[PDB]
Design a binder for this molecule. Sequence first.
Ligand SMILES: CCCCCCCCCCCCCCCCC[C@@H](O)O[C@H](CO[C@H](O)CCCCCCCCCCCCCCC)COP(=O)(O)OCC[N+](C)(C)C
Ligand SMILES: CCCCCCCC/C=C\CCCCCCCC(=O)O[C@H](COC(=O)CCCCCCC/C=C/CCCCCCCC)COP(=O)(O)OCCN
Lengths: 70, 83
Amino acid sequence: WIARTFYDGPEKNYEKTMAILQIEAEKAELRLKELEVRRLMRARGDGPWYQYPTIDKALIDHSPKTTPDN
Amino acid sequence: AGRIASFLKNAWAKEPVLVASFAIGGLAIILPSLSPYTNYAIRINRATPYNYPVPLRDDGNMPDVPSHPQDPQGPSLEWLKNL
Ligand SMILES: CCCCCCCCCCCCCCCCC[C@@H](O)O[C@H](CO[C@H](O)CCCCCCCCCCCCCCC)COP(=O)(O)OCC[N+](C)(C)C
Ligand SMILES: CCCCCCCC/C=C\CCCCCCCC(=O)O[C@H](COC(=O)CCCCCCC/C=C/CCCCCCCC)COP(=O)(O)OCCN
């Protein structure tokens, strides 16, 4: 009576634990991947992150400048 | 109307310097927006050649660009002479 009224079967806890373990394992591998990606991006600078600003080339004046040799 | 005129009359007495200064300042602020010769002054400033006019590379498709200074093509400064 106690088992029927207050508790459930072992399969419920078993599968819940499996789902939780899978979720946490994916989270851990994602954290490692994010750390590695951050390290590589900061070391190289070829990714969208750590793109420090540079001088815009649209500000340059392309016209004769009173002197042929610029 | 009447109050403003009375205030102006009172200020014109015993305080002519401030009234004259304010009138001159207001005129100097307002008039240039109405004067038609400011465009003439801008044109004169733009028509003053400070740098050497660098020639363009002719490609056979430049009808508005003259080939010689005496050619009719190009801007004219006859209006400046007429002033
Ligand atoms: C002859 C009898 C001998 C044995 C006597 C046993 C006595 C048992 C009383 C002790 C109860 C406490 C154990 C569990 C309580 C909470 C556990 C909880 O999970 O159970 C809830 C149910 O518990 C009851 O609602 C609460 C128990 C309280 C009743 C005790 C009686 C005396 C209380 C005094 C009240 C005061 C009244 C006013 C006094 C003036 C809901 O369960 P649920 O999470 O959905 O489970 C889902 C699985 N399903 C689908 C199979 C159901
Ligand atoms: C919108 C244009 C703005 C730019 C123009 C102004 C250029 C600079 C002129 C102003 C310089 C500073 C002015 C500071 C004003 C202070 C006035 C003040 O406090 O003096 C009062 C008294 O001054 C006054 O009476 C109040 C202001 C006077 C009237 C000001 C002119 C208002 C507008 C008049 C002109 C309107 C437009 C022109 C109409 C004329 C017709 C063409 C106290 O006098 P005391 O020296 O302390 O003497 C005390 C001991 N007896």
